[PDB]
Design a protein around this motif. Structure first.
Motif, PDB file in Angstrom:
ATOM      1  N   UNK A   1      64.793  32.870   5.371  1.00  0.00           N
ATOM      2  CA  UNK A   1      63.433  32.827   5.896  1.00  0.00           C
ATOM      3  C   UNK A   1      63.204  33.937   6.917  1.00  0.00           C
ATOM      4  N   UNK A   2      62.005  33.967   7.489  1.00  0.00           N
ATOM      5  CA  UNK A   2      61.657  34.976   8.482  1.00  0.00           C
ATOM      6  C   UNK A   2      62.215  34.605   9.852  1.00  0.00           C
ATOM      7  N   UNK A   3      62.540  33.328  10.029  1.00  0.00           N
ATOM      8  CA  UNK A   3      63.081  32.869  11.294  1.00  0.00           C
ATOM      9  C   UNK A   3      64.451  33.449  11.585  1.00  0.00           C
ATOM     10  N   UNK A   4      65.254  33.618  10.539  1.00  0.00           N
ATOM     11  CA  UNK A   4      66.597  34.166  10.688  1.00  0.00           C
ATOM     12  C   UNK A   4      66.542  35.629  11.120  1.00  0.00           C
TER      13      UNK A   4
END
Length: 30
Positions: A1-4
């Motif tokens: 995801x973009x969170x990582x």
């Protein structure tokens, strides 16, 4: 995801945005 990638990109955000501004201003000499 973009969170990582957001975590590591968080600190690089201010570095990339700050370097791009000084890079374009200096590139004017080239």
């Amino acid at each position: 995801v973009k969170g990582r990638i957001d975590a590591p990109d968080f600190p690089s955000s201010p570095a990339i945005l700050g370097k791009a501004a000084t890079d374009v201003v200096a590139a004017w000499k080239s």
